[PDB]
Amino acid sequence: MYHGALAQHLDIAQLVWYAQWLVIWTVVLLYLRREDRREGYPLVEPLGLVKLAPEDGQVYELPYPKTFVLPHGGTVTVPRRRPETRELKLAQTDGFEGAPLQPTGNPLVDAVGPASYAERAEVVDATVDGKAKIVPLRVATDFSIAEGDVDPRGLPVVAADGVEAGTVTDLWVDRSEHYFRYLELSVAGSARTALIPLGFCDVKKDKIVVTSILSEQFANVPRLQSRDQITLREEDKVSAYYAGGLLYATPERAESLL
Amino acid sequence: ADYQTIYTQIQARGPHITVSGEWGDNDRVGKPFYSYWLGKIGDAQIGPIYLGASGIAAFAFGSTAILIILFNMAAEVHFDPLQFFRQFFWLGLYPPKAQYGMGIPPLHDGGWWLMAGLFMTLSLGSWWIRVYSRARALGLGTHIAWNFAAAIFFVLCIGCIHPTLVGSWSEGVPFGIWPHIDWLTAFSIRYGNFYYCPWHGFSIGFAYGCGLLFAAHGATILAVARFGGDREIEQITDRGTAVERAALFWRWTIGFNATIESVHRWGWFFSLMVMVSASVGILLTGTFVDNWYLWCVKHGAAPDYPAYLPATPDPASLPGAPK
Amino acid sequence: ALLSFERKYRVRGGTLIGGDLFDFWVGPYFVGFFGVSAIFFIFLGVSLIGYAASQGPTWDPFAISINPPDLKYGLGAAPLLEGGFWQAITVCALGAFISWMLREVEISRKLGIGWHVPLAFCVPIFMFCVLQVFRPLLLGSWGHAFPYGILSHLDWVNNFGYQYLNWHYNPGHMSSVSFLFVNAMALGLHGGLILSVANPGDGDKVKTAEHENQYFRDVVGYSIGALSIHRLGLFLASNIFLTGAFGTIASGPFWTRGWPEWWGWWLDIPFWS
Amino acid sequence: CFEPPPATTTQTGFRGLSMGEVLHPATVKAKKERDAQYPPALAAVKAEGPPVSQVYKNVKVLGNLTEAEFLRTMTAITEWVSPQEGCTYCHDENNLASEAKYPYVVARRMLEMTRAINTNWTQHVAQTGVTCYTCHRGTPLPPYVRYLEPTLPLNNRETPTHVERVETRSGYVVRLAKYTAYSALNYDPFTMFLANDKRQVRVVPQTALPLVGVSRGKERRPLSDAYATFALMMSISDSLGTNCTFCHNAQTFESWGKKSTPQRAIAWWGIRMVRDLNMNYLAPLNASLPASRLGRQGEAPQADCRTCHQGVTKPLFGASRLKDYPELGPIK
Numbered sequence A: 001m002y003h004g005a006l007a008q009h010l011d012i013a014q015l016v017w018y019a020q021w022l023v024i025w026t027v028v029l030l031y032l033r034r035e036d037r038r039e040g041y042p043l044v045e046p047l048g049l050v051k052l053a054p055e056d057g058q059v060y061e062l063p064y065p066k067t068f069v070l071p072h073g074g075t076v077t078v079p080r081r082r083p084e085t086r087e088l089k090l091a092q093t094d095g096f097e098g099a100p101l102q103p104t105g106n107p108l109v110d111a112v113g114p115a116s117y118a119e120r121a122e123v124v125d126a127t128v129d130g131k132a133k134i135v136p137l138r139v140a141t142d143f144s145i146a147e148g149d150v151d152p153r154g155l156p157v158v159a160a161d162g163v164e165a166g167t168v169t170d171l172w173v174d175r176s177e178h179y180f181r182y183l184e185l186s187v188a189g190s191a192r193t194a195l196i197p198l199g200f201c202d203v204k205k206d207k208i209v210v211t212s213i214l215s216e217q218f219a220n221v222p223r224l225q226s227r228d229q230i231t232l233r234e235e236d237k238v239s240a241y242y243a244g245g246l247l248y249a250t251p252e253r254a255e256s257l258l
Numbered sequence B: 001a002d003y004q005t006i007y008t009q010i011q012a013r014g015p016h017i018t019v020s021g022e023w024g025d026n027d028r029v030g031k032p033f034y035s036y037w038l039g040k041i042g043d044a045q046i047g048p049i050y051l052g053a054s055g056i057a058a059f060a061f062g063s064t065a066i067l068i069i070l071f072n073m074a075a076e077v078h079f080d081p082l083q084f085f086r087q088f089f090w091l092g093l094y095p096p097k098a099q100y101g102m103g104i105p106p107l108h109d110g111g112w113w114l115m116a117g118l119f120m121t122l123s124l125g126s127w128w129i130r131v132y133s134r135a136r137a138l139g140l141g142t143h144i145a146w147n148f149a150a151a152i153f154f155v156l157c158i159g160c161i162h163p164t165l166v167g168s169w170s171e172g173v174p175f176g177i178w179p180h181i182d183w184l185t186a187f188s189i190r191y192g193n194f195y196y197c198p199w200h201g202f203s204i205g206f207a208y209g210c211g212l213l214f215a216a217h218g219a220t221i222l223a224v225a226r227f228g229g230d231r232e233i234e235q236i237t238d239r240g241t242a243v244e245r246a247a248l249f250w251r252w253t254i255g256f257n258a259t260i261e262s263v264h265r266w267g268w269f270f271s272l273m274v275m276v277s278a279s280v281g282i283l284l285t286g287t288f289v290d291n292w293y294l295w296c297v298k299h300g301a302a303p304d305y306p307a308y309l310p311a312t313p314d315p316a317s318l319p320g321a322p323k
Numbered sequence C: 001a002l003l004s005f006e007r008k009y010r011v012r013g014g015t016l017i018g019g020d021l022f023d024f025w026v027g028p029y030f031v032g033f034f035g036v037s038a039i040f041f042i043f044l045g046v047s048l049i050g051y052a053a054s055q056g057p058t059w060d061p062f063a064i065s066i067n068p069p070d071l072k073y074g075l076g077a078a079p080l081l082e083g084g085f086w087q088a089i090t091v092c093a094l095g096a097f098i099s100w101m102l103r104e105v106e107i108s109r110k111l112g113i114g115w116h117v118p119l120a121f122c123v124p125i126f127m128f129c130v131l132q133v134f135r136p137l138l139l140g141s142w143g144h145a146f147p148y149g150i151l152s153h154l155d156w157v158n159n160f161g162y163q164y165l166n167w168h169y170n171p172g173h174m175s176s177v178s179f180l181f182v183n184a185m186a187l188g189l190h191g192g193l194i195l196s197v198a199n200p201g202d203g204d205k206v207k208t209a210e211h212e213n214q215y216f217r218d219v220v221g222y223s224i225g226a227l228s229i230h231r232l233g234l235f236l237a238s239n240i241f242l243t244g245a246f247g248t249i250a251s252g253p254f255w256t257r258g259w260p261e262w263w264g265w266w267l268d269i270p271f272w273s
Numbered sequence D: 001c002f003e004p005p006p007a008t009t010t011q012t013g014f015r016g017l018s019m020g021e022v023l024h025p026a027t028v029k030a031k032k033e034r035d036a037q038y039p040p041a042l043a044a045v046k047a048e049g050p051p052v053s054q055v056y057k058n059v060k061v062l063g064n065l066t067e068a069e070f071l072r073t074m075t076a077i078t079e080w081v082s083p084q085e086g087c088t089y090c091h092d093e094n095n096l097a098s099e100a101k102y103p104y105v106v107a108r109r110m111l112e113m114t115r116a117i118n119t120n121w122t123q124h125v126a127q128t129g130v131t132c133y134t135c136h137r138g139t140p141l142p143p144y145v146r147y148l149e150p151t152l153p154l155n156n157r158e159t160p161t162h163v164e165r166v167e168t169r170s171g172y173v174v175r176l177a178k179y180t181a182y183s184a185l186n187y188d189p190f191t192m193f194l195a196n197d198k199r200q201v202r203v204v205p206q207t208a209l210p211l212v213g214v215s216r217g218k219e220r221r222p223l224s225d226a227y228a229t230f231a232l233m234m235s236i237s238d239s240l241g242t243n244c245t246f247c248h249n250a251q252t253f254e255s256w257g258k259k260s261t262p263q264r265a266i267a268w269w270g271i272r273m274v275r276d277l278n279m280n281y282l283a284p285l286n287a288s289l290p291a292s293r294l295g296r297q298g299e300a301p302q303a304d305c306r307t308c309h310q311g312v313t314k315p316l317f318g319a320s321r322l323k324d325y326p327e328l329g330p331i332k
C-alpha cells in the first residue's frame, strides 16, 4: 500500500494542488484586486437621462473603507468619493469615447495632460517631529552641501532654448531624508523666484541646464504662497509644470518623434 | 534625462536623526559616519546599530554554528591552512552518510551536523525576535517579521521537518559552499525530478514573479521621482500626481492597475509565497510522493516525445541478464 | 470606464510613430501604432500555435509542445512540422515583445514620466534572444533553442543543464541565482516596510519617512533610503538576466566541459597543488 | 579559463530536448592523435606445422597456435605492453619457458582475461574487442588504474605533487574531486560500485507514491546513496569524455525505452564487465605482484571505465585488431 493514496486514484498531493490554486485566486481576486480599488473608484463615465440604481458591481468590487490616522493629526478614509470638480481646458477631438482630449488654451498654465496635478492637501509636509520638511537652506541652516559636490547657488539656469533664464538662489532640502529636492532661482527679468525639482536639472560645474521648458516659460512656473514653505499640493503644481514642458514646450513635441 | 534616478547629483549633509523606540534607545551603539561614495546611490550615513538581547543572542548562537562547521571543515584538509584556503568550497559538514533513522548520529557521522543545525536554528529564532521587536518598539506593523517567518520555516523544512517526516537525518542539507549545492541534485534525483513537482513550479513562478514585480515597481517609481513618487507613505495617505500617473501607465498598458499601497502588498504576497509554496512542496516530498515525474505521469500531466536514437530496453530486465 | 482622476491625462501626443492615426484608447488600453502591431503578432503567433498544436498528437495543455528543428537543419529554414512552426512562432514572439516594449514608451511619453519601465522590460527580451537567437547562432543551429511547451521547456532546461555535468557550478548561473534570491528577499523587505509604516495596527498613527530609516538602521546598521531602494530593486532584478546571459552564452561556444572543472583554474594554481 | 568557438555538437534525443555531445574540436584532435599510436597489425603469417603444444614446453593458453603464429603473438604482446623492455620483461633471457619473473604469470592471466573480454563481454566490447594495448598503451603498468583509495594524477605516468601523494591527508578532497569531475561529492564510486557487485546503482523509486514498508526510518536507503550514484555518473561521464545526455533523457534518469539511448544499455554491460574483471582477474593478482605494485591496503591496481576509454566514448576511437589477432578472441 502507499503513503498518500486516498482512494480510487485520488491522493493527497493531488488534492493539495487544487487547494493551492484556490488559495491563490481567492487572495488575488477577492483581496488584492479589491485593495487595488481604494483610489479612483467608482469609475466615472457620462450618464443617462434616467438612472436610479446603486449598480451592484460597484458595491461588489470595492473594499470596505479603511481609515488612516495621520501622524500629526486627522484621518483619511479610502476608498472615498474624490471627484474631479475643477475645470479643464480640453476639447474632445473625435466623437468616440476612446478619443484623446486637446488643450484649448495653454496646457502648461491650464495644467492639463502631462501638466496636471492631483488635488493634494494644501498642507505643508512635516517631519516626524512636526517641523516643515522641504525648506530652503536659508532656513535649514543645520544642513549643507556635501564636500565634493557642486554648490549651485550663483550658477545660471539655461532653458531648453539655450537662453540663460535665471540664477540659482538656494536649494530646498528634505530634512526627513537629507536629500535636496528643488533648486530655487531668481527668474531673469521677473520679480520672482521659481522652484524646479532636481530631476529636471542637469547640474554642471558652471551652469544648471534645464531642458523641459524654454526660458520664456519659467515666467509662469507656479508661485508659492510663502517663501520658505511649500504645500503637498504646491509641490504637485511646480513639478507638473515642467513635466508638461516635455510634451508642450514647443509644437513639435506632441507629435511623432519619427 | 532624470539623472537623479541614476545617482544623487548634490548630496545633502545634515544632523543625525534618531526616532525613539518604546525601548532600547540606549542600546544603539556607534557613531554615525558618512560615506561620500555611498551617498551617490544611497543614504551616506552608516551606523548606529541597535544591540539588544535578541540580537546578541542571535550573534552568539550563529557564531557557535560557524565554529562547529569551520572546525570540521578544517579537519577535512587535516588542519593544513593553505589547503584549507584552497579547498574551501569543496569542504563540508555532512549529515549521516549511514541510515541511523531518527537515531541521534555519532559525532563523526552527522553528530556535529545536528549540532550546528541546532545552533543555527536558535540563531534564526533570536534574529526573528529582533526583527519583530524593532518594529513594535518603533510603533510599526509586523509585516516584515511575518515575511521572515516563512523563510525560516522553509529552512526548517529542508533542515529538520522533512528528515523527521520520513525518519532520516541523512536527508538534511550539508553545510558548505559546494556541498549544499550538491544536495539539490541528490534530492531532486532521489525524488524523481523536481521540475515535475507542482510546488517547485509555483515557487519559481513567484520567484520570477518577484523579479518581474520589483523591476516594474522600482522602474515605475524612478519614472515618477520627478513628482516625488519615492515618498510612498504620503502618496498613500494623500494621492498625488506621481501615483496617478504611475497607476495610469499600468492601466493603459495592461488594462488594470494597483495603488501605491497595494502594489507593495502584491510585492509582499509574491515574496511570501516563494517560501510558502516551497515549504508545501517539501512537506509533500517523501511523505506522500516518491517520484514526482511518475506522479505527473499518473495524473496525465507529463510530456512524452518520440525516440530519436532507438528505444532502449533495460538490460537488467533482459531474460538472462546478470544483476 | 475612467478612473476618477483619469480624464485630465488623456491628451493627444507622445507617439513614436503614427501620430494621430492610432492615438486613442480601446477601453482602458491605449492603442497607438505599436498597440496595433502588438495585436497583429499575437494573433499570428497564437494562430500558428493552434495550427501546430492541432497537427500534433495532443491537446492536453501540459503536454503540447512545439519544438525547434533537428540540428542538421542548421540555421536554415526547416519543414513547417519539423521546426518550421517553431521558427515562425519565434518571430511572432519577438515582434509582440518588442511592440509591447515600444508601446510603453509612447504611454510614458504621453504621461510625461521617465521611460524606465520599457527600458527595464528590455532585459527580459534580451534574455529571450540569448536563449533563442544568439546562442543558437553561435552554435550554428536553430536546434539548440528551447521548445514551446509548458512542461517540455523544463525538459530542455534540464537536459541543457546536465550537458555540462553540474550546471550549479557555472559561475554565471551562481551569480544569476544570487540575484534571484536577493531580489525576492528585498521585495519582501520593501513591501513589508511600507505596509508596516502605513498599517501599524490598532488605531496607531501612520508613521513616517524617519521611521523607515530608523527601523533598518536598528536592524542592520544601514538604511539605503526611499528613492534608492527602488533603484536597488531594479538593479538586483535586472542583474538576474544580465549576469545569467553570460553563463548561458559561455556554455558551448566558450566552454565544452562540465562546469565543476572550470573551477580548476582555482584548485589547480600550482602554488598549492 | 575558456575554450573558443566553434564547438562540435551532436543530437542524441528528439529535437528541442537539448540532448547530445558538446566537443571542443582541439581536444578531440588531441585524443585522436594519442589513440593513433595504436601499432598496426603485424603482417599475417601462415599456419605451417605443429601446434606449439607439441613444439614448446610451457605453453598453456596459446598452445593451439603454430610456431610463427605464436611468435607473431609474442612480438605483438611485446609492442603493446613492454616495448621499451623487449621480450625479457617476462622471460628469463636463457629459458623461455621460465616463470621466474612475475610479468610472465601475470601476462599468462592477462591472456586469459583478454580472451574473456572478447569472448564473453561482447555485449559491451562487441566486435571491436580489446587487446593488451587498450589498457597498457605501451607500458607494463597501464596509465589509468584504480586503487582502493583515490590517487593523483589520474595518469600515473605523471609524477605527484606533495598533496597528490596519497600519504598527504590534506590532499584527499582534491584526490576525490578530481575523480568525480571536480565535484565535491564526498564519495568514491570506484570502491563503492566498480570494485565489486555489492552495491545497487539505482536509487530512484519506480512508483509515484511511497510504498508502505520501504519508506520510513531504517527501512529507507539513506540519501547518501543518491550522492554516490551521482558521483559514479560524474565519473563515468568524465571517463568517457561525455555528458549525461549521451545516455539519459534527464526528464527521467530512471526510465529506459525512449528515455534512454543505446549507449546506456552498453554502459550497463560495461559496469557488469568491469566488476567481473576486477573481482575475478585483477584483484587476485595481488597474490602475484611485487609489493611495489600494491596499494596502501595491499590491493592490486584495478580497472574502471577510464582504464580502456581514457576519455573517449569508444576506446581508441573504435579501432580494432580483433580480426588480426583471433588468438585473443572471440574464442569459439
Ligand code: BCB
Residues within 6 Å of the ligand: B195, B200, B201, B202, B204, B205, B206, B208, B209, B212, C046, C049, C128, C131, C146, C150, C151, C153, C154, C157
Ligand atoms: C532558461 C530557463 C527558462 C525557464 C525556466 C522555468 C522553470 C524552471 C519554470 C518555469 C515556469 C514557467 N515558465 Mg519558463 N518561460 C515562460 C513561461 C512559464 C510559465 C508556464 C511558468 C510560470 C512562469 C512565471 O510565472 O514567471 C513570472 C511571471 C508572472 C507571474 C506573470 C504571469 C505570467 C504568466 C503565468 C505566463 C503564462 C504563459 C502561458 C504559457 C501563455 C503562453 C502563450 C499563450 C498566450 C499562447 C515564458 C513565457 C518564457 C519565455 C517566453 O522566455 C519562459 C522561458 C524560460 N523558462 C526559460 C527557458 N520556467 C515554472 C513552471 O511551473 O513551469 C511549467 C517553472 O517551474
Ligand code: BCB
Residues within 6 Å of the ligand: B061, B062, B063, B065, B066, B120, B123, B124, B151, B152, B154, B155, B158, B183, B184, B185, B187, B188, B193, B194, B195, B197, B199, B200, B203, B204, B207, B274, B277, B278, B279, B281, B282, C157, C181
Ligand atoms: C537538479 C536540481 C534542481 C533543483 C532542486 C531544488 C530543490 C532540492 C529545491 C528547489 C527549490 C527551489 N528551486 Mg529548484 N529551481 C529553481 C528555483 C527554485 C526556487 C524557486 C526554490 C527554492 C526557494 C529558494 O529561494 O531557496 C533559497 C532561499 C532560502 C534557502 C531561504 C533562506 C532563509 C534563511 C532565514 C536565511 C538564513 C541566513 C543566515 C545568515 C544563516 C547563516 C547561519 C550560519 C550560522 C550558517 C529554478 C528557478 C530552476 C530552474 C530555472 O532550472 C530550478 C531548477 C532545479 N531545482 C533543478 C531541477 N529546487 C526548493 C523548493 O521549492 O522545493 C519545492 C527545494 O527545496
Ligand code: BCB
Residues within 6 Å of the ligand: B046, B047, B048, B049, B155, B158, B173, B177, B178, B180, B181, B184, C168, C173, C174, C175, C177, C178, C179, C181, C182, C185, C220, C221, C222
Ligand atoms: C533549496 C535551495 C537552496 C539553496 C540554493 C542555492 C543555489 C542554487 C545557489 C546558492 C548560492 C548561495 N547560497 Mg544557498 N544558502 C546559503 C548561502 C549561499 C551563498 C553561499 C550563496 C549566495 C547567497 C545569496 O546570495 O543569497 C542572497 C543574499 C542576501 C539576501 C544578502 C543579504 C544582504 C543584506 C540585507 C545586507 C546587510 C547590511 C550590512 C549587515 C550592513 C553593515 C553595516 C553595520 C554592521 C554597521 C545559506 C546561508 C543558506 C541557508 C538557508 O542557510 C542556503 C540555503 C540554500 N541554498 C537552499 C539549500 N544557494 C549560490 C552559490 O553561490 O552557490 C555556491 C547558488 O548558485
Ligand code: BCB
Residues within 6 Å of the ligand: B184, C097, C124, C125, C127, C128, C157, C158, C159, C160, C161, C162, C166, C167, C168, C170, C172, C173, C176, C177, C180, C240, C241, C243, C244, C245, C246, C247, C248
Ligand atoms: C539541471 C539544470 C538546472 C538549471 C539550468 C539552467 C539553464 C540551462 C539556465 C538557467 C538559468 C537560470 N536559472 Mg537554473 N536555477 C535557478 C535559477 C535560474 C535563473 C536565475 C536563471 C535565469 C532564468 C531564465 O533564463 O529565465 C528566462 C526567462 C525569460 C527569457 C522570460 C522572457 C519573458 C518575455 C520577455 C515575455 C513573455 C511573455 C509571455 C508570452 C506573456 C504571456 C501573456 C499573458 C500572461 C497575458 C535556481 C535558483 C536554481 C536552483 C534552486 O537550483 C537553478 C537550478 C538549475 N538551473 C538546475 C541545476 N538554469 C539561465 C541562466 O541565465 O543561467 C546562466 C539558463 O540559461
Ligand SMILES: C/C=C1/c2cc3[nH]c4c(c3C)C(=O)[C@H](C(=O)OC)c4c3nc(cc4[nH]c(cc(n2)[C@@H]1C)c(C(C)=O)c4C)[C@@H](C)[C@@H]3CCC(=O)OC/C=C(\C)CCC[C@H](C)CCC[C@H](C)CCCC(C)C
Residues within 6 Å of the ligand: B058, B059, B060, B061, B062, B063, B066, B067, B123, B124, B127, B131, B144, B145, B147, B148, B151, B271, B272, B274, B275, C181, C182, C184, C185, C188, C189, C219, C220
Ligand atoms: C522570499 C523571501 C526570502 C527572504 C526573506 C527575508 N530574509 C530576511 C528577512 C526577510 C523578510 C529579514 O527581516 C531578515 C533581515 O534581518 O534582513 C535585513 C532576513 C535575513 N536574510 C538573510 C540572508 C538570506 N536570505 C535569503 C533568502 C530569503 N530571505 C528568501 C529569498 C538567503 C538565501 C537566498 O540564501 C540568504 C543568504 C540575512 C541577511 C538576514 C537574517 C540574519 C540572521 O538570521 O542572523 C543570524 C545570525 C548570525 C549568523 C550571527 C553570526 C554572524 C557573525 C558575523 C559570525 C562571526 C563568527 C566568528 C567566527 C567569530 C566572531 C567573534 C566576534 C567577537 C568578532
Ligand SMILES: C/C=C1/c2cc3[nH]c4c(c3C)C(=O)[C@H](C(=O)OC)c4c3nc(cc4[nH]c(cc(n2)[C@@H]1C)c(C(C)=O)c4C)[C@@H](C)[C@@H]3CCC(=O)OC/C=C(\C)CCC[C@H](C)CCC[C@H](C)CCCC(C)C
Residues within 6 Å of the ligand: B208, B209, B211, B212, B215, B216, B219, B253, B254, C038, C041, C042, C043, C044, C045, C046, C089, C092, C093, C096, C097, C100, C104, C117, C118, C120, C121, C123, C124, C147, C148, C149, C150, C153, C237, C238, C239, C240, C241
Ligand atoms: C529581470 C526582469 C524581468 C522582467 C521584467 C519585466 N517584465 C515585464 C515588464 C518588466 C519590467 C513589463 O513592463 C511587461 C509588463 O507589461 O508587465 C505587466 C512585462 C511582462 N512580463 C511578462 C511575463 C514574464 N516575465 C518574466 C520575467 C521577467 N520580466 C524578468 C524576471 C517571465 C518569466 C521569468 O518566465 C514571464 C513569463 C508579461 C506578463 C509582460 C509582457 C506582456 C507582453 O509581452 O504582451 C505581448 C504578448 C502577449 C500578450 C502574448 C504573445 C504570444 C506570442 C506571440 C507567442 C508565445 C510564444 C512564447 C515564446 C511561448 C512560451 C511557451 C512556453 C515557454 C510556456
Ligand code: HEM
Residues within 6 Å of the ligand: D056, D057, D058, D059, D060, D061, D062, D063, D071, D074, D075, D077, D078, D081, D082, D086, D087, D088, D089, D090, D091, D096, D097, D098, D103, D104, D105, D107, D108
Ligand atoms: C619477444 C618477441 C618475445 C619472445 C621471442 C617470446 C617467446 C616466447 C616463446 C617461444 C614462448 C614459448 C616458450 C616455452 O616453451 O614456454 C613464450 C611463452 C610465453 N611468453 Fe613470450 N616472448 C616474448 C615476449 C613476451 C613478453 C613481453 C611477455 C610478458 C608480457 C611474454 C609472456 C609469455 C607467456 C605468459 C608465455 C606462455 C604463454 C602461454 O600460452 O601459456 N613473452 N614466449
Ligand code: HEM
Residues within 6 Å of the ligand: D077, D081, D103, D104, D106, D107, D110, D111, D112, D114, D130, D131, D132, D133, D134, D135, D136, D140, D141, D142, D145, D277, D282, D289, D293, D300, D301, D302, D303, D307, D308
Ligand atoms: C593482453 C593479452 C595483455 C597482456 C599480455 C598483459 C600483460 C600484463 C603484465 C605483464 C602485467 C604486469 C605488469 C607489472 O609489471 O606489474 C599486467 C598488469 C595489469 N594489466 Fe595487463 N595485459 C593484457 C591485457 C590487459 C587488458 C586488456 C587490461 C585492461 C582491461 C589490462 C590491465 C592491467 C592492469 C590493471 C594490471 C595491474 C597493475 C599492474 O600490475 O601493472 N591488461 N598486464
Ligand code: HEM
Residues within 6 Å of the ligand: B189, B316, C162, C165, D200, D201, D202, D203, D204, D205, D229, D230, D233, D234, D236, D237, D240, D242, D243, D244, D245, D246, D247, D248, D253, D254, D255, D263, D264, D265, D267, D268, D271
Ligand atoms: C551525468 C552526470 C549523469 C547523471 C546525472 C546520471 C544519473 C543517473 C541516475 C540518477 C541513475 C539512476 C537510475 C535509477 O535509479 O533507476 C543512473 C543510472 C545509470 N546511468 Fe546515468 N547519469 C549520468 C551520466 C551517464 C552516462 C554518460 C551514461 C552512459 C555512459 C550513463 C549510464 C547509466 C546506466 C547504465 C545506469 C544504470 C546503472 C545500473 O543499472 O547499475 N549515465 N544515472
Ligand code: HEM
Residues within 6 Å of the ligand: D117, D124, D125, D126, D127, D128, D129, D130, D134, D236, D240, D263, D264, D266, D267, D270, D271, D272, D274, D303, D304, D305, D306, D307, D308, D309, D313, D314, D315, D318
Ligand atoms: C565502465 C563501467 C564503462 C562504461 C560506463 C563504458 C561505456 C561505454 C559506452 C557508452 C560504449 C558505447 C559507445 C558508443 O558510442 O556506442 C562503450 C564501448 C566500448 N567499451 Fe566501454 N565502458 C566502460 C568500461 C570499459 C572497459 C573497462 C573497457 C576495456 C576493457 C571498455 C571497452 C569498450 C570497447 C572496446 C567499446 C567499443 C565497442 C564498439 O562498438 O566500438 N569499456 N563503453
Ligand SMILES: CC(C)=CCC/C(C)=C/C=C/C(C)=C/C=C/C(C)=C/C=C\C=C(C)\C=C\C=C(/C)CC/C=C(\C)CCCC(C)C
Residues within 6 Å of the ligand: B066, B069, B104, B114, B115, B116, B117, B118, B120, B121, B155, B156, B158, B159, B160, B172, B173, B174, B175, B176, B177, B180
Ligand atoms: C539536536 C536534535 C536532536 C534536534 C534538533 C534538530 C534541529 C533543529 C536541526 C537543524 C538542522 C538545520 C536547520 C539544518 C539546515 C542546514 C542548511 C539549510 C544549510 C545550508 C547552507 C550552508 C552554507 C552554504 C554555508 C556553509 C558554511 C560556510 C560557507 C562557512 C560560514 C562562514 C561565514 C558565515 C563567515 C562569516 C564572516 C562574517 C564577517 C560575515
Ligand SMILES: COC1=C(OC)C(=O)C(C/C=C(\C)CCC=C(C)C)=C(C)C1=O
Residues within 6 Å of the ligand: C182, C185, C186, C189, C190, C191, C193, C194, C212, C213, C216, C220, C222, C223, C224, C225, C226, C227, C229
Ligand atoms: C523606502 O523603503 C526602503 C528603504 O528606505 C528607507 C530602506 O532603506 C530599506 C533598507 C535597505 C537596506 C537595509 C539595504 C541593504 C540591502 C538589501 C538587498 C535589502 C528598505 C528594505 C526599503 O524597502
Ligand SMILES: [Fe+2]
Residues within 6 Å of the ligand: B217, B221, B232, B264, C190, C194, C230
Ligand atoms: Fe515602493
